[PDB]
Amino acid sequence: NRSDELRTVYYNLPLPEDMLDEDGLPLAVYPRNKIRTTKYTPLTFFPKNILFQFHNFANIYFLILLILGAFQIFGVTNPGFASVPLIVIVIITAIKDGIEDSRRTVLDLEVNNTRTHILSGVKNENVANLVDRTLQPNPECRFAKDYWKNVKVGDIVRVHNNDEIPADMILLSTSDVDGACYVETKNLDGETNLKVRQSLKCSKIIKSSRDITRTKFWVESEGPHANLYSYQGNFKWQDTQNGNIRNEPVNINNLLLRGCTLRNTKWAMGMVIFTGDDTKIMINAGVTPTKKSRISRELNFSVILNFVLLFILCFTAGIVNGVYYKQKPRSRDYFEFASTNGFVSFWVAVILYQSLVPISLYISVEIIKTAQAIFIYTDVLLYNAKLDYPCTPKSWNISDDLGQIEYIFSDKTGTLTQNVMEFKKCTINGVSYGRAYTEALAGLRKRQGVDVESEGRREKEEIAKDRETMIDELRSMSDNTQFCPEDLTFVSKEIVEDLKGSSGDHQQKCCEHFLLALALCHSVLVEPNKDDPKKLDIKAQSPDESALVSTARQLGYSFVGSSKSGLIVEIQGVQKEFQVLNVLEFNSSRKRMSCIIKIPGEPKALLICKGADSVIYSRLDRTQNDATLLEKTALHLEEYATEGLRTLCLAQRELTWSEYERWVKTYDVAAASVTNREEELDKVTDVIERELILLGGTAIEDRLQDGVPDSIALLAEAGIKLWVLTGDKVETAINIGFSCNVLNNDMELLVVKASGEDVEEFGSDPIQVVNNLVTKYLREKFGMSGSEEELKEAKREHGLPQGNFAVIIDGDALKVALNGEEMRRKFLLLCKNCKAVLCCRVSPAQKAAVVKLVKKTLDVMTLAIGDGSNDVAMIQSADVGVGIAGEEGRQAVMCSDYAIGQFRYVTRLVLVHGKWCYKRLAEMIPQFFYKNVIFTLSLFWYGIYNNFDGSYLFEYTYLTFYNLAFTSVPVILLAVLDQDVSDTVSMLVPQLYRVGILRKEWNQTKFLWYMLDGVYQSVICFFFPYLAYHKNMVVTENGLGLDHRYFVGVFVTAIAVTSCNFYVFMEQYRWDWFCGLFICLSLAVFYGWTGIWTSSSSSNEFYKGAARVFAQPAYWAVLFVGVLFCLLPRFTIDCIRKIFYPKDIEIVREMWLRGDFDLYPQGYDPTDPSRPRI
Amino acid sequence: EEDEVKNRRPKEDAFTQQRLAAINPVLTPRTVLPLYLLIAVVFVIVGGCILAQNSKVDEVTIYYQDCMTNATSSWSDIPSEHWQFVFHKYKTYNTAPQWRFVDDESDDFTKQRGTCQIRFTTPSDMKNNVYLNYVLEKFAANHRRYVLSFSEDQIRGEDASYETVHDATGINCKPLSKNADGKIYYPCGLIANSMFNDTFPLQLTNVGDTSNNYSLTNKGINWESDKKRYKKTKYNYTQIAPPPYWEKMYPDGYNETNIPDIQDWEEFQNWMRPGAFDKITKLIRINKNDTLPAGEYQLDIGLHWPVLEFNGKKGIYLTHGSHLGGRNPFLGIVYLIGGCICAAMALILLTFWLFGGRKIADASSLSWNMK
Ligand SMILES: *[C@@H]1O[C@H](CO)[C@@H](O[C@@H]2O[C@H](CO)[C@@H](O[C@H]3O[C@H](CO)[C@@H](O)[C@H](O)[C@@H]3O)[C@H](O)[C@H]2NC(C)=O)[C@H](O)[C@H]1NC(C)=O
Ligand SMILES: *[C@@H]1O[C@H](CO)[C@@H](O[C@@]2(O)O[C@H](CO)[C@@H](O)[C@H](O)[C@H]2NC(C)=O)[C@H](O)[C@H]1NC(C)=O
Ligand SMILES: *[C@@H]1O[C@H](CO)[C@@H](O[C@@H]2O[C@H](CO)[C@@H](O)[C@H](O)[C@H]2NC(C)=O)[C@H](O)[C@H]1NC(C)=O
Ligand SMILES: *[C@@H]1O[C@H](CO)[C@@H](O[C@@H]2O[C@H](CO)[C@@H](O)[C@H](O)[C@H]2NC(C)=O)[C@H](O)[C@H]1NC(C)=O
Ligand SMILES: CC(C)CCC[C@@H](C)[C@H]1CC[C@H]2[C@@H]3CC=C4C[C@@H](O)CC[C@]4(C)[C@H]3CC[C@]12C
Ligand SMILES: CC(C)CCC[C@@H](C)[C@H]1CC[C@H]2[C@@H]3CC=C4C[C@@H](O)CC[C@]4(C)[C@H]3CC[C@]12C
Ligand SMILES: CC(C)CCC[C@@H](C)[C@H]1CC[C@H]2[C@@H]3CC=C4C[C@@H](O)CC[C@]4(C)[C@H]3CC[C@]12C
Ligand SMILES: CC(C)CCC[C@@H](C)[C@H]1CC[C@H]2[C@@H]3CC=C4C[C@@H](O)CC[C@]4(C)[C@H]3CC[C@]12C
Ligand SMILES: CC(C)CCC[C@@H](C)[C@H]1CC[C@H]2[C@@H]3CC=C4C[C@@H](O)CC[C@]4(C)[C@H]3CC[C@]12C
Ligand SMILES: *[C@@H]1O[C@H](CO)[C@@H](O)[C@H](O)[C@H]1NC(C)=O
Ligand code: BEF
């Protein structure tokens, strides 16, 4: 992100001897244009993956046991059957991550092979007037097809219509005169309007390849600094007339960024400067982190606690084995024939309980995560059939986070809103025409208390009837060649009635003049379609102007043709040509576009301006007006502002010939002037429009994604607070936040700005302005003027939405609001008490910094739902990257975790899938750490007898077939196929997700309780068989000889396996035919495999365990009481804590079995615009 | 300018969508108290059965570890800290036994030699099956090196060389692999070497009416299937030698017709099964045909095993048994306690539900709909 390290790009000029050190290769090298989003580089995949795997401390412990059982010979058997499990686990993780990176590489190869045209015919010398008309051109120089990966610095690139620009290019030529290309920056910024880019002045002479092959020049450019509104270059060439070097500045407007889509333009020819990583996106992109989960870290801490227990056990074993060796007289010095002795005893007891944390922990968690990701991928309600895109996860280890997600940082381009603009309402002569049932009004009516579903369907039916009536009336009134009902966004029926003359003559005349003015003041171009010649489409610089012209052509006021001085208008069928005398273009600083036409009648002039509401209301005449249309129009606009409709205003005025003569005189004074002629045109534009007569206003709704106002409601009910890290500007963001029910009508909008209207009171350096604004907003409404006394107490609240305000920050105010530490804490403490924190004009780095601020400070789980190449940084640095997929966003879906079809799927990827996965892992981890304590503890409890000499109580084949076959599959099934409540009741009652917010399911006290239960269980599992043997040790129903330590081992293993499986089944929330089947199958596996191993050849010491143990009534008499006494405490505690102190889930399940949620279907989804009333 | 040119839906199943057939249970006092009551009744009934069965088993345990010292050459009683009679018919029939010692000066093993004669009376019968085992308290046979000390090739009768006996896997006889002369012991390891050596009689010599003595048999005391692993020796009669503690049983070595066939030697197979815990009770005499009537009986035990040198103990244990092995009331006690605990827990839950219960399913008892 450094602006230094400049560069120089030549064309048709060999580099001087200063850059090439006699090898023909310049010292400077430029990175390849290949985009690389893979997590692990294909050259360093194995070392990075092995280091990432060995981050976990259990892997280091396994490696330590390996290297200390291999070097220390004659302590264990051959180590060839101890390294294989660890190596297999590591290679399994390696193959899994390699498959993930292969998927990402497939995506990168699909992205990199896009077609582009590169100048072929002249070799490149970089990596391996203007036109000299004297020399003949080159007939082989053309624009040949090529890919993006082979676009080197200095290659002339031609971009066709609707073609994505490969890399940063210096504009050289365009089909249009003056070279005014239009680019769609919807990926690099929030601007929905097409940005205009001018080419170079001297480079306009060339028009084809035959002219550029004779061009020779060089561009000295600054280093890539990752900024979207700044660039400094120097174009330089040599004149063909005389001998001299000519220089020309190159600003940002002559730059074609990577993610920019060349739209509404035939072809743009330019020269590439930055490539690959040097582009303005790949620097604001990031480094595609590994994205570790959250439960993994607490898992490492739990592994450390298990290490502590193992060390305690081994210490108390090595003490007693070493105190017993110093006691006389023992039976060892007769028949059996202290530093190093105690040391070898300790390191024998270490290998004894070497499985207090088994090798199957980091291979069970990985299997569970992959299975949960696959079950996410194969969900039918997360499939968007509009483009055949299921919810494909790209980071498989991030699956339990979605159950702990608390903050959601949305976008506003392809995430909250679609890319359509529909004209909805208008105000003509103080009369409001237009019908619409906005989902904001639906949420408002729901909050009032009235019915929404039935009433909503009724209202929609009425709108449909009014629409068909309007279509019939407009088709019966006249015939228009451009008319089409599918593009008729307007629906009102009173408009056509008052346009045909059902409300007098003046009203009809005013409506006609307004509809004509809508098709006059615009820079819209008309292009005949490719397939249908009669269907002439409107190519405009902005979508709102396109919507205005479309709803004008619908009402019988079509605008066609762009003549020299004039434009054709088909009014109801009759074609008339006007005369656009002047067109004052819509500037970003003017916010109003004006047209001065010559209307006959000497004739008169007509000035029609279209602009914002307040901007045009300022340039009005409160004296010569209706004085009744102004109040009505203001009320209607204030009404439309509360419905997400970005309203405009239209004002016309008549002029005589002397006024227009005076105006063109001062214009010719100002137009052909020098020394900053801009201010002159601004003031003449201001003085011509100092007075105007408002003749109507408009209203264009920016349609959101389906079911967004209800998905937001579900998420806010679950407790998931959401911020809107918007793009383009402020007013668009405000009306959108009004559209989706984020901004209410009574919420005060705390504006945090730098050079606004409330900054004159604190007029100083912007830092002090922002500080004073934040402090005054943290003082009167909610007095918390402080940093470490309120933030430290608010961090231990887990997040509860409250405050009833909203906050709007700009780009510069944000850049200042998170540059200092105290400012960071103050800004964050402010936003934490707000309801609807927004943002405006935020660069990628700034939104990434906001996400990092919310993540690091006030540690929570953030979500980064968003589409666009500018949203990549915040997606990567948010631990959950949900990139909206489609045929538009092909860079924020790659460098992300999940790629859902549209935003309305988040409230299912997070509310039912995420909660499920989080609860499943939070129940699996303690179960897994408890099912191993109950086993190795028995090996220890056999130590207080035998005096800790190191004799295995179980056979050498039960230590490797207990953590592998007897009890692993039930735990995997509890973690893959468990459900708190069905998805219908999950999305019906989202408040249960609050449990995942407070971190109330996976805490260390739960793990300690489970380990204590394992200790008690193991005590019982060992001391019931012993107490059976404790009196006379002859319990076999025929004498005949029991009591081999392997038989007691079978007793203990049976009790422990049955207790562990029934424990897994007790804590499971639902009992289905799969988990119960596999639990019974695991029990049968234990029994039948004992039966197969004992009754076999290579079972030397055993050889009859099954026939000699399972056939006695004492075995079952011990097994039943063992299972009952291991399950009775936990079951009683559950039955009391689910009767005396029931949590939320218990009450939800009780009322679910009572019959509260027994009307809704199986695949219920409240975020669906097509669900019936169920 | 010539450059002017031109089915993934997830399979809706019952398993892919995680909508498998299931039952979602809840622990309501309508489905908890019946379970507790059923479990309690079942466990109390089973425990009553087990205790009624255990209150009938009769046993006789007599420790004789100090017969070579504390006993005399006349019929003298045994101290009260050496014998225990448990007879359910007569629960107060002490009638202490009478033991005597008859020293044999032939053996030069002063530690333990001679013969102990024990006369014990039984006032009841033992139906159709009588077991006589030897108890060895304070003998540690479950240590790390002691237990792994043998060879399963010599147990299987193979002619295992010195390498297969010494350089084997983690289960091998390391200390006693080879003697001084260079001949690998046939029974190797500290288990076979340290075998129990007291010679028990083949009958219970009667006292009352000597015309009918009660007989026993050393055949059928170990599992029959165990004869599928203990095979006959296949050694060349010149490369083996008895273990260092077996030198008094084979003072001349291993000649032609003295090599013991461990297959039909069920006591040796009984000893190659190292006991798990401290006490070691191994069956040595079995009677399957005749009932043992009342009266006095006499045992002639040949004391060849030194036990008092580590303050250990040993003795005889005579019993009929039961379906749950020897007399051990732990199972019945645990069943009774489990049943009583389940019943008390059911009663406590009933009290808490009828005195301090809650609503069935309320919309105001949740966490958010209450504050
Ligand atoms: C039953 O097995 C017994 C194993 O404990 C065994 O006792 C052992 O007898 C041998 C003699 O054969 C002793 O060996 C030592 O004896 C001589 C003379 O006393 C010593 O000078 C030597 O050092 C030699 O090692 C063992 O010490 C002894 N073991 C114990 C623990 O006392 C019995 O002999 C066996 N029974 C029969 C009938 O032989
Ligand atoms: C082999 O060595 C045997 C000694 O273990 C011997 O057995 C007897 O006969 O040895 C003693 C000599 O009479 C006697 O006192 C033992 O009681 C006998 N033992 C048994 C088990 O009968 C064999 O006679 C010897 N055989 C040969 C062929 O030398
Ligand atoms: C049953 O056992 C008794 C007790 O040993 C036998 O009576 C004596 O047995 C010993 C040897 O066992 C002889 O030396 C005595 O001479 C026997 N005494 C008498 C009076 O006979 C008894 O003979 C045995 N009965 C049978 C049928 O074998
Ligand atoms: C119980 O009866 C069985 C069946 O008769 C006895 O088994 C046989 O006993 C005789 C002794 O006279 C042996 O010769 C046979 O070899 C035995 N048959 C076998 C081993 O298959 C058994 O000995 C009797 N036991 C008692 C204690 O009376
Ligand atoms: C790296 C560390 C964990 C290795 C283990 C070091 C400790 C736990 C081991 C190594 C040396 C061992 C000690 C060696 C000597 C004795 C003296 C003996 O009378 C009691 C046991 C005692 C006190 C041992 C206790 C355990 C011991 C202190
Ligand atoms: C009976 C005499 C001779 C030996 C004493 C051994 C017993 C009583 C002592 C020695 C080591 C002690 C153990 C040391 C460590 C632990 C692990 C802990 O999680 C539970 C307590 C427990 C299990 C202690 C229980 C009592 C204990 C087992
Ligand atoms: C030779 C005869 C005496 C052996 C009898 C052994 C009997 C007591 C043992 C062996 C097989 C055992 C059964 C094996 C299977 C089960 C099914 C289980 O759901 C309930 C216990 C039950 C029913 C066991 C009851 C006790 C049982 C019947
Ligand atoms: C929110 C949670 C932590 C509140 C605590 C609820 C639990 C842990 C408390 C509240 C009531 C308590 C129970 C009250 C009565 C009994 C019956 C007694 O014979 C055994 C203890 C036992 C079973 C107590 C165990 C702990 C208990 C269940
Ligand atoms: C829940 C706790 C407080 C009380 C549990 C009740 C248990 C421990 C008590 C109540 C009745 C008692 C039993 C009463 C009768 C006998 C018969 C006797 O020959 C052996 C002891 C035995 C079998 C007692 C064992 C302990 C016992 C079962
Ligand atoms: C045998 O032990 C008993 C038990 O204390 C004792 O009274 C008696 O004196 C002992 N006999 C001899 C000979 O030591
Ligand atoms: F294109 Be955006 F609003 F980050």
Coordinates of C-alpha atoms in Angstrom, one line a residue, chain A residues 804-1011:
Chain A
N804 CA -33.2 3.6 19.5
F805 CA -30.8 5.7 17.4
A806 CA -28.9 5.3 14.2
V807 CA -25.4 6.5 13.2
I808 CA -24.2 7.6 9.8
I809 CA -20.4 8.0 9.2
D810 CA -18.8 9.3 6.1
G811 CA -15.5 8.1 4.6
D812 CA -13.2 10.8 6.0
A813 CA -15.0 10.9 9.3
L814 CA -14.4 7.2 9.5
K815 CA -10.7 7.4 8.5
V816 CA -10.3 9.9 11.4
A817 CA -12.6 8.0 13.7
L818 CA -10.4 4.9 13.9
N819 CA -6.9 6.4 13.5
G820 CA -6.3 7.0 17.2
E821 CA -6.7 4.5 20.1
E822 CA -8.9 6.7 22.3
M823 CA -10.9 7.7 19.2
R824 CA -11.2 4.0 18.3
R825 CA -12.6 3.1 21.8
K826 CA -14.9 6.1 21.8
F827 CA -16.3 5.4 18.3
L828 CA -16.8 1.7 19.1
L829 CA -18.5 2.5 22.4
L830 CA -20.8 4.8 20.5
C831 CA -21.7 2.3 17.8
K832 CA -22.2 -0.4 20.4
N833 CA -25.3 1.5 21.9
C834 CA -26.7 2.3 18.5
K835 CA -29.4 0.3 16.6
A836 CA -28.6 0.9 12.9
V837 CA -25.0 2.0 12.5
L838 CA -24.4 2.8 8.8
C839 CA -21.4 4.0 6.8
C840 CA -20.8 6.0 3.6
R841 CA -18.0 6.4 1.0
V842 CA -15.9 3.7 2.8
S843 CA -12.9 2.3 1.0
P844 CA -12.0 -1.4 1.3
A845 CA -9.2 -0.8 3.8
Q846 CA -11.5 1.3 6.0
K847 CA -14.3 -1.3 6.1
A848 CA -11.6 -4.0 6.8
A849 CA -10.4 -1.8 9.7
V850 CA -13.9 -1.4 11.0
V851 CA -14.3 -5.2 11.0
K852 CA -10.9 -5.7 12.7
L853 CA -11.9 -3.1 15.3
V854 CA -15.1 -4.8 16.1
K855 CA -13.4 -8.2 16.1
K856 CA -10.2 -7.6 18.2
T857 CA -11.6 -5.1 20.6
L858 CA -14.9 -6.4 22.2
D859 CA -14.1 -10.0 21.1
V860 CA -17.1 -11.3 19.1
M861 CA -17.8 -13.3 15.9
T862 CA -18.3 -11.0 12.9
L863 CA -19.8 -11.8 9.5
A864 CA -18.9 -10.1 6.3
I865 CA -21.8 -10.7 3.9
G866 CA -21.1 -8.8 0.7
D867 CA -20.6 -8.8 -3.1
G868 CA -17.9 -6.8 -4.9
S869 CA -14.1 -6.6 -5.4
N870 CA -14.0 -3.8 -2.8
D871 CA -15.7 -6.1 -0.2
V872 CA -12.8 -8.7 -0.4
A873 CA -10.8 -7.2 2.5
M874 CA -13.6 -7.1 5.0
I875 CA -14.7 -10.6 3.8
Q876 CA -11.2 -12.0 4.5
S877 CA -10.6 -10.2 7.8
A878 CA -13.9 -11.2 9.4
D879 CA -13.4 -15.0 10.2
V880 CA -16.6 -15.7 8.2
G881 CA -16.7 -14.5 4.6
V882 CA -20.1 -14.9 2.9
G883 CA -19.8 -13.7 -0.7
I884 CA -22.9 -13.2 -2.7
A885 CA -22.7 -15.2 -5.9
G886 CA -24.1 -14.5 -9.3
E887 CA -23.1 -13.6 -12.9
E888 CA -21.8 -10.2 -11.5
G889 CA -19.6 -10.8 -8.5
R890 CA -16.8 -13.2 -9.5
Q891 CA -14.1 -12.0 -7.1
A892 CA -15.8 -11.7 -3.7
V893 CA -17.1 -15.3 -3.9
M894 CA -13.6 -16.8 -4.4
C895 CA -11.9 -15.2 -1.4
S896 CA -14.7 -16.1 0.9
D897 CA -16.0 -18.9 3.1
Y898 CA -19.5 -19.5 1.7
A899 CA -21.0 -18.4 -1.6
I900 CA -24.8 -18.3 -1.2
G901 CA -27.2 -17.3 -4.0
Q902 CA -28.7 -14.2 -2.4
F903 CA -28.8 -12.4 0.9
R904 CA -32.0 -14.1 2.0
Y905 CA -30.1 -17.3 2.6
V906 CA -27.9 -15.9 5.4
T907 CA -30.8 -16.0 7.8
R908 CA -30.7 -19.8 7.2
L909 CA -27.0 -20.4 6.9
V910 CA -26.7 -18.7 10.3
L911 CA -29.9 -19.2 12.1
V912 CA -30.5 -23.0 11.7
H913 CA -27.4 -24.4 10.2
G914 CA -24.9 -22.4 12.3
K915 CA -26.8 -22.9 15.5
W916 CA -27.0 -26.6 14.8
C917 CA -23.3 -27.0 14.0
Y918 CA -22.3 -24.9 17.1
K919 CA -24.5 -26.9 19.4
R920 CA -23.3 -30.2 17.8
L921 CA -19.6 -29.4 18.4
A922 CA -20.2 -27.9 21.8
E923 CA -21.8 -31.3 22.8
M924 CA -19.2 -33.4 20.9
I925 CA -16.1 -31.9 22.5
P926 CA -17.0 -32.7 26.1
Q927 CA -18.3 -36.1 25.1
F928 CA -15.1 -36.9 23.3
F929 CA -12.9 -35.7 26.2
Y930 CA -15.1 -37.7 28.6
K931 CA -15.2 -41.0 26.8
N932 CA -11.4 -41.3 27.0
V933 CA -11.1 -40.3 30.7
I934 CA -13.5 -43.2 31.6
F935 CA -11.1 -45.6 29.9
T936 CA -7.5 -44.6 30.8
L937 CA -8.6 -43.8 34.3
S938 CA -9.4 -47.5 34.6
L939 CA -5.8 -48.3 33.6
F940 CA -4.8 -45.9 36.4
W941 CA -7.2 -47.2 39.0
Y942 CA -5.7 -50.7 38.4
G943 CA -2.6 -49.0 39.7
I944 CA -3.5 -48.7 43.4
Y945 CA -3.5 -52.5 43.2
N946 CA -0.4 -54.0 41.6
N947 CA 1.3 -50.9 43.0
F948 CA 1.6 -49.0 39.8
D949 CA 4.1 -51.4 38.3
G950 CA 2.8 -50.7 34.8
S951 CA 0.7 -53.8 33.9
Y952 CA -2.0 -53.2 31.3
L953 CA -5.5 -54.2 32.6
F954 CA -6.8 -54.5 29.1
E955 CA -5.5 -56.5 26.2
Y956 CA -3.1 -54.9 23.7
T957 CA -5.9 -54.8 21.2
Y958 CA -8.5 -53.0 23.3
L959 CA -6.2 -49.9 23.6
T960 CA -6.4 -49.5 19.8
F961 CA -10.0 -50.7 19.3
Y962 CA -11.7 -48.5 21.9
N963 CA -10.9 -45.1 20.4
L964 CA -11.4 -46.5 16.9
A965 CA -14.4 -48.8 16.7
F966 CA -16.3 -49.1 20.0
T967 CA -17.2 -45.5 20.7
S968 CA -16.1 -43.2 17.9
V969 CA -19.1 -43.6 15.5
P970 CA -21.8 -42.7 18.0
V971 CA -20.0 -39.5 18.9
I972 CA -19.5 -38.6 15.2
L973 CA -23.2 -39.2 14.7
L974 CA -24.1 -37.0 17.7
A975 CA -22.0 -34.3 16.1
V976 CA -23.2 -34.7 12.5
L977 CA -26.9 -35.8 12.9
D978 CA -28.1 -33.9 15.9
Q979 CA -30.8 -31.2 15.9
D980 CA -32.0 -29.0 18.7
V981 CA -35.3 -28.4 17.0
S982 CA -36.4 -28.9 13.4
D983 CA -35.7 -26.0 10.9
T984 CA -39.4 -25.0 11.0
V985 CA -39.3 -24.4 14.8
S986 CA -35.7 -23.2 14.5
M987 CA -36.7 -20.3 12.2
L988 CA -40.0 -19.8 13.9
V989 CA -38.3 -19.1 17.2
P990 CA -35.0 -17.5 16.4
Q991 CA -34.5 -16.3 20.0
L992 CA -32.9 -19.7 20.8
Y993 CA -29.9 -18.4 18.7
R994 CA -29.2 -16.1 21.6
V995 CA -27.7 -19.1 23.4
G996 CA -25.0 -19.1 20.8
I997 CA -24.4 -15.4 21.4
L998 CA -23.6 -15.5 25.1
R999 CA -21.3 -18.5 24.6
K1000 CA -23.6 -20.5 26.9
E1001 CA -23.0 -24.0 25.4
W1002 CA -19.2 -24.4 25.1
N1003 CA -17.6 -23.1 28.3
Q1004 CA -14.8 -24.7 30.3
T1005 CA -17.0 -25.3 33.3
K1006 CA -19.0 -27.8 31.2
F1007 CA -15.8 -29.6 30.1
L1008 CA -14.7 -29.8 33.8
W1009 CA -18.1 -31.2 34.8
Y1010 CA -17.8 -33.8 32.0
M1011 CA -14.3 -34.7 33.1

